[PDB]
Symmetry: D2
Subunit: 393 residues, 4 copies
């Protein structure tokens, strides 16, 4: 298997740089956690002789990681021609870049891609930290369903868009918040997680869960955003008191403590790069693609994607489901967390928002992405007219 | 050569293949001997008529060799079809025990149907077929026709024109009491007001008899020429008790929701006719499979609908297709479906198969009790939910795999 | 007594002096209750311009009760001349407000000059005053809604009528919903409620007889002044009545009609009732019948039961001015009903009826000049439902010397 | 002279004091009436037989009021016959024993006419909290001090219609009216702005004392503590209004909520509350003191909104059948105004499903079935009703 792969890259010896170039062109990064042993071995070899790899040295280096390297080089990844795909991503990025309207809650614009096989691409401002805000709502819902199951969670929150052209009603007709993607629903979801412990431990628990979803890439916290959310959270206090009065919380809930935790969760920071990996975990059935670790149950992921599909883009949710047909979640910092199930996760970020509250550039990019590729939920992988299918050669 | 390869597969060391042995093997892939794409092969077999040498076999199968090769090399979307239909039969028998609900009675033609009629038909995107129960009994599409006529409208007129007159979203728990959204358009094509507007868009400028003929011809193609009929007795009854639909018609007219030059009372007549179109589970499953197969009819290979028409139809069936149960159905079942008052549920598994489930008794939401029960069990068993993962699906079975 | 009254007006009374004094009370010489007196005066000017004690007694004796109340300043508004002078000033002030749009949805409405403006007053004692265009016929339209509701309650009682229609404003939900939560039209003053009310009247006879019955009832309310019919308005209403057909089918589906109703026949009758014509003068008498507990003030006949009148006034108060109803109830505080021809039927209970008419409508559908006049009227006089009769700051109380 | 005329009406040489007192009470006035203070002081100084001269000395300072009383010029001339009807209505409502006390057999009705004629039956001297019955009173204070235009920049003027009171704000982002909780909360924020809550409360208490002609007004600290501990719905309203900028600039919203709970906890008796209602019936003048308490504008606006908005979700039915401005509260009080005639307070703790006192609702319907008091009854033609304004 090491030999087979040796011949593919070879003709007596392989220069190390040639192996690295070929590896990167598959879309994997040399820092990928699943390539740690291989890359450690290569570094050790460049020490123990001072740039050329025979059959035997090669086998020694790649043997621990041979399954993944074989899939990579045999073009078995979900997107086999990754270089051609990222060239299209860059063109969509540049086209969205020209849409400069909208209002910040301005010129920063980044897009990151992580496939379900861990292939990575970034364009623009993808290493700048920003708060998740409402992008965290699907993530904490997934955690709640993961730990508690669908039946328990949906005793407290509903499963459908309100329809009302406003977040204006807090409760559906059964006295539950409409869904986990609206503020009242996210507040109730927050109350379900890790009940019985203090806020510091609840927060640590959620942070550890997000670290795993992001394959240990950047997850941080903006104390400045937290302070500001809590000082202008009058609408959220209104929701909290309303839910308390209507008995919407689990028995023994400290409602004002839950609101504080809620503001903390909104203030969690990511980059486009780290958030794309979180989205890829959702695209990959709850397994983190760059570590192989099982993070969320399949039930948690399926429910989260269903509700992002119908409820994730504020009052634009219905239009977005129809035209784009992908589970997505927007936030006021300008983030759009986007999932292409079975294919990839993305995070798009540009601060200026349209009248609906959605990033202008991200919305434009999402429409162009589905115009180009047969990724709409109800596109037919068989016949798709003029679209490109990046899953094929 | 391809015919020879296939000859050896069926021959298994023998010099000649008995005809019955070829037919049995063919049926076990899921294809029917009547499949329109196997016409030349079956014609040749009839001309030959009970033993087939290499040469005679090649003469018979040569015109249809591509399809027969895919069949016998287990390349169909569901390779182990026999095992799959065994699961379908178990789900069928389990739903059969759920005999609650009430048959619709508001007209004599609905009230007449036995509560105990129950059929399920499957047609995969490769034309593999299976039926259990009462699958050859005609019943009216009723609201099951709504996605089909919307697909026709989008096919002929494009998304932009159609959605100038009808919206694209569920109204939400505002029930179905409001006829128009805030932009004075019916909320979507799956509610009565939206379907009435859609009906006014089709084949404009010709009389109702020609509009109806056109729609009937279109449904014939979607069904691969299987049973499509018309119930004049249902039509007469719909039209005499259609007070709610007349209220909608006058309301839309007042709010100028129709294309210029519309004869609103004539459109209502056409609407009642379309609701009275009859299918069987068998023929409707093929229509659903056309939608699962990106607009190509799987048992004919004919392009019937544009990709845009099919995608838009499936999107709206997903969110709007099961009356007030639409949101719950989208969440738990996660498949585009459309129910009707005759007890039909038209069900699409994109890229995999179409189905029609039919049982007259309806739940409190208006949906077939047995069909709803079957749809839940189907997705509990198989990784067919829209947001199931194709790689990691816990203990579900994936019928696309060996 | 005739003698007492003789001395009040008096050795001999010139006829012209008796007539001018009579007119200054606000009564008209044509008042039906003065017929015998005026007949006797005309006969006297034929036989034998001067009236001694004896001739006077012969003339006024048949009508002496009414003439005594008139001359002893016992009418509801004793200084009527001073009151009508205020009415005229309010009229002239509203005349300057010439904004709004004439209704155009049918040719018969679109036709009316924006500048037509009339106000007529009829007190509960039959005192009359008109200013401006008060003898021009126009269709009641929605102004007929309280009148046919009153007829229904008169003939059938409150409990029967309110089995089919509700008793409350829908709330600023506007009038997009045809039915309340109990599947009844919200009240008799909205189109769906008026359609159901129409189905209750004179059931079991044909439309021609239903119409004749309503017309005879309106004639009595108007003390036999002008009540007519605009066939041209009727034809136009019926050919563009799409919204009303929508309501009719909706009500039929929801079983809102009395058993055996011919819904399309009811719609036809509904359009006929909307096309009934009045003048400001004749409609003010209809409003005065409602102000006077169901007795027509110029004939003394009782047109409607006390129950019918009370219920009609209650619903005009809360539901009568379309989406402006709540604002109108708060600021003006009088039962009123508007219509798309520019009419405002206005009732001051225990005091008077009025009809204000000016075609140009505001954005709510109410006559701009009529609305302006109604506000000024209550700013000036202590007529608001919740003004006090004893302590009213700087308002004038016309029912007081 | 007026004292002499009155002397003759009450053909002896001398009037026993008891005979003057019993005749006075039969007009409906009480001997403690503040407007009869000088007369009753003089009688006490005199103390049992009164000649022409002594009588004149006693009644002279109050002679105008005593003349109206004895000449049957009061709004209800045959008061004794009227109170006999009130007692029958009282006994008939007494038999309606359903409903649930807010989480019991007490029943009182008090009448005060616009002329200060008084009658009570049942439990009319037991203190209970106004609760929502305070809403029209504080709205009247706000309009009195600030005018209609300013107040209605912050609160609307109409019933919401909506199934219940599920929406806090109308389409213009104002609470629908002053009689719903959100509207009363905004009204509370308008009163005596810029001073602390203790002074705002003192000011309102002084205003209520005048409306009640100085009869019983108290405060239930126990009710206040309970309202604030379970006021989650009111905190939701407060935060919602704050977010939508519904309060005057510089408002301390949590302080306003505290004041709101205090105002709900003010105590009255049926007797003292009937006088407050009579102030509203009498154009803003307190009938038993003659003092001007509220502007005519404040009173008219208050009565208009009580008419359409005062009886929770029963308001539209009540307006149609009863046709009188009224305001109910969760302690079982119904404050009722018959404009130009009288105020009443009905109190019985058990409430119907709408939140209204069962006995009070029954009494209000019977009162208008009997008498031509509906706002759209006619004063000349009224079928078989009794008109208590006539002899
Ligand atoms: O109708 C129901 C379901 C429900 C909620 C509570 C009780 C029931 C029941 O009757 O069982 C039903 N939902 C509701 N959700 N939220 C409501 N009110 C909140 C606070 C006030 N508000 C608005 C919005 C716009 C304008 N003004 N105020 C939104 S009402
Ligand atoms: O006002 C909007 C626009 C719109 C659309 C979606 C939501 C809203 C909203 O209420 O916020 C408004 N649309 C409407 N569509 N249909 C309406 N009325 C029809 C006939 C009468 N009717 C009913 C229903 C129940 C009871 N009574 N009559 C249905 S009015």
């Amino acid at each position: 298997l090491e030999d087979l792969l040796f011949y593919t890259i070879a003709q007596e010896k392989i220069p190390v740089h040639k192996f690295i170039t070929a590896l990167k062109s598959t879309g994997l990064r040399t820092s990928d956690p699943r390539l740690k042993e291989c890359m450690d071995m290569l570094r050790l070899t460049l020490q123990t002789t001072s740039v050329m790899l025979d059959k035997d040295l090669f086998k020694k280096c790649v043997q621990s990681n041979i399954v993944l390297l074989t899939q990579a080089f045999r073009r078995k990844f979900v997107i086999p021609d990754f270089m051609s795909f990222t060239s299209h991503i860059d063109e969509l990025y540049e086209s969205a870049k020209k849409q400069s309207g909208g209002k910040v809650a301005p010129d920063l614009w980044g897009v990151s891609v992580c496939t379900v096989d861990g292939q990575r691409h970034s364009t623009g401002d993808t290493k700048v930290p920003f708060c998740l805000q409402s992008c965290v709502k699907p993530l904490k819902y997934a955690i709640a369903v993961n730990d508690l199951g669908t039946e328990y969670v949906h005793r407290y929150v509903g499963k459908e868009p309100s329809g009302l052209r406003f977040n204006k009603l807090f409760l559906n007709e059964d006295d539950k918040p409409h869904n986990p993607m609206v503020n009242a629903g996210a507040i109730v979801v927050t109350s379900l997680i890790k009940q019985g412990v203090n806020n510091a431990e609840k927060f640590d628990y959620v942070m550890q869960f997000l670290n795993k979803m992001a394959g240990n890439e950047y997850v941080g916290f903006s104390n400045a955003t937290f302070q500001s959310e809590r000082e202008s959270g009058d609408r959220n206090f209104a929701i909290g008191y309303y839910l308390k009065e209507k008995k919407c919380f689990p028995e023994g809930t400290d409602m004002v403590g839950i609101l504080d935790f809620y503001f903390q969760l909104c203030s969690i920071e990511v980059t486009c790069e780290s958030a794309s990996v979180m989205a890829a975990t959702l695209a990959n059935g709850g397994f983190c693609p760059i570590t192989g670790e099982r993070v969320l149950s399949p039930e948690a992921v399926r429910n989260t994607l269903s509700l992002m599909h119908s409820c994730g883009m504020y009052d634009f949710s219905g239009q977005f489901a129809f035209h784009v047909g992908l589970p997505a979640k927007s936030g006021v910092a300008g983030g759009i967390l986007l999932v292409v199930p079975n294919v990839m996760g993305m995070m798009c970020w540009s601060p200026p928002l349209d009248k609906m509250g959605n990033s202008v550039k991200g919305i434009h990019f999402c429409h162009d992405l589905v115009s180009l590729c047969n990724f709409h939920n109800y596109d037919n992988l068989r016949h798709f007219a003029k679209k490109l299918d990046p899953r094929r050669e």
